[PDB]
UniProtKB/Swiss-Prot annotation:
It is found in: Host cytoplasm. Residues 1-113 are annotated as: Disordered. Inhibits host translation by associating with the open head conformation of the 40S subunit. The C-terminus binds to and obstructs ribosomal mRNA entry tunnel. Thereby inhibits antiviral response triggered by innate immunity or interferons. The nsp1-40S ribosome complex further induces an endonucleolytic cleavage near the 5'UTR of host mRNAs, targeting them for degradation. This inhibits the integrated stress response (ISR) in the infected cell by preventing EIF2S1/eIF2-alpha phosphorylation upstream of stress granule formation and depletes host G3BP1. The gene is rep. This is Host translation inhibitor nsp1. The chain holds residues 11 to 125 of 7096 of the full protein. Residues 2-113 form the CoV Nsp1 globular domain. It comes from Severe acute respiratory syndrome coronavirus 2 (2019-nCoV).
């Protein structure tokens, strides 16, 4: 399937134990996709002061369309030193590894895979 229905645990930035996916744009996109597939991916909602608390490169989920079965269609865009790799809509959040942090909510997405 080109798209997969996922329910992403929404984590508070200060709870996050593993604050990025790796050290290159290609690695973080690779790792983010693997974690999304394995159900070990969380989402942090981007507000003032969040991103400086996470590790670059960042992986964003961005709205790719204006929402089947409640699931917003999203795709991955990475960012490193102010350059983005990919082009998409509004940020729903920044992806991070999930290693058992308690979420505050779930974000239903349809991920272009």
């Amino acid at each position: 399937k080109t798209h997969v229905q996922l329910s992403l645990p929404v984590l508070q930035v200060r709870d996050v134990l593993v604050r990025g996916f790796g050290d290159s744009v290609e690695e973080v996109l690779s790792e983010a996709r693997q974690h999304l597939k394995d159900g070990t991916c969380g989402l942090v909602e981007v507000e003032k002061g969040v991103l400086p608390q996470l590790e670059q490169p960042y992986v964003f989920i961005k709205r790719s369309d204006a929402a089947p079965h409640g699931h917003v269609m999203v795709e991955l865009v990475a960012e490193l030193e102010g350059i983005q790799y990919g082009r998409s809509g509004e940020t729903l959040g920044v992806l991070v590894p999930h290693v058992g942090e308690i979420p505050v909510a779930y974000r239903k997405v349809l991920l272009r895979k």
